[PDB]
Design a protein around this ligand. Structure first.
Ligand code: ESN
Length: 345
């Protein structure tokens, strides 16, 4: 087998000429030449089976991405694993190869307003499809937005996703950790389990803000600091918005804060398009009920050069998961079952 930075990559005979791209807690990713389709592809090696949480993420991603088909969502092209459960220690997920991601691009490149408009359009277009399947991505952030050399965009990492459940979204104060900190909506810290579509629109608003200036808008230094940053810009919530928070710990925390005024978006973003800032304001609304939805966002004047509802497709049916009571050994079985279609057979 070919070897990459110490690791076996058991991907042949189909996939050859491996080059290292990167690594993280998920495992290791390489580009490889696909000897069937005659393109280089991305292959990520995941070895999740000793951690229930890694099994959850692996299974969720596989189940979602095999069902989804959308230009702005990364596919799964192939899955390589051992022929038996006994022998399966790794799962190799083969995906379209992209040149970069929005995190890398924002650390190096100024984005023209046309680039910001086009990226946001593609983000919202993919999100329309995801939300139309009754799915929440729940970890939208620059590094989960892949880009190619012509600025086509694809959303990746569906391992944190959930089916939407707005009737069971209420919880208590300072208990929930949904999303990545800088992209996490105020309500997560206050009273929300992150089971409504509004969680994703918030993260998109943070992304848009970050594309305008190359800096995260709410750079919390730790979990508790995040609300300080959000409220620092948005200002004190209104009586009405406060009255929606029925939980007393969360209510009284907010009431305990000194009054803060809204920092105007045109002072934070003096070079931004005024239509972009109007949309930004609507995405970064404190009250998740008042926050703009994905289909309204697409119809916003900022995106009028792109907007075409007939070319913004939806899922053929809502998606249908209950994996937190399942042991890692059971999750391994379901991953084996779900990857069966890619086997010689
Ligand atoms: C913790 C954990 C345990 C078990 C599973 C997981 C899973 C499900 O949550 N998470 C993931 O795999 C998450 C974490 N990643 C890692 C990853 C790496 C590469 C690519 C990718 N990159 C390119 N090009 C590069 C872009 C940047 O510049 C150089 C080129 N092209 C195509 C692709 Cl697909 C995508 C993903 C992805 O989705 C996580």
């Amino acid at each position: 087998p070919e070897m990459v930075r110490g690791q076996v990559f058991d991907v042949g005979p189909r996939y050859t000429n491996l080059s290292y791209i990167g690594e993280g807690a998920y495992g290791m990713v390489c580009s490889a030449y696909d000897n069937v389709n005659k393109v280089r592809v991305a292959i990520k090696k995941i070895s999740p089976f000793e951690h229930q949480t890694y099994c959850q993420r692996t299974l969720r991603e596989i189940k979602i991405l095999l069902r989804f088909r959308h230009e702005n969502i990364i596919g799964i092209n192939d899955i390589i694993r051992a022929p038996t459960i006994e022998q399966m220690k790794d799962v190799y997920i083969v995906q379209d190869l992209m040149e970069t991601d929005l995190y890398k691009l924002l650390k190096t490149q100024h984005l023209s307003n046309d680039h910001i408009c086009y990226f946001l359009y593609q983000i919202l277009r993919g999100l329309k499809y995801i939300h139309s399947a009754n799915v929440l991505h729940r970890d939208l952030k620059p590094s989960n937005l892949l880009l190619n050399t012509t600025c086509d965009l694809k959303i990746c990492d569906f391992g944190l996703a959930r089916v939407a459940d707005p009737d069971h979204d209420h919880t208590g104060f300072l208990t929930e950790y949904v999303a990545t900190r800088w992209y996490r909506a105020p309500e997560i810290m206050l009273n929300s389990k992150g089971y409504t579509k509004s969680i994703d629109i918030w993260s998109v608003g943070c992304i848009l803000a970050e594309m305008l200036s190359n800096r995260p808008i709410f750079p919390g230094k730790h979990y508790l600091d995040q609300l300080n940053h959000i409220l620092g810009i948005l200002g004190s919530p209104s009586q009405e918005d406060l009255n929606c928070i029925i939980n007393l710990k969360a209510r009284n925390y907010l009431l305990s804060l000194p009054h803060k005024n809204k920092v105007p978006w045109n002072r934070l973003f003096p070079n931004a398009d005024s239509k972009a800032l109007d949309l930004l304001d609507k995405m970064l609304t404190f009250n998740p009920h008042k926050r703009i939805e994905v289909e309204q966002a697409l119809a916003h004047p900022y995106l009028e050069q792109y907007y075409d509802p007939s070319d913004e497709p939806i899922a053929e049916a809502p998606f249908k998961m209950e994996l937190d009571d399942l042991p890692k050994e059971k999750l391994k079985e379901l991953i084996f079952e779900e990857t069966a279609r890619f086997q010689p057979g």
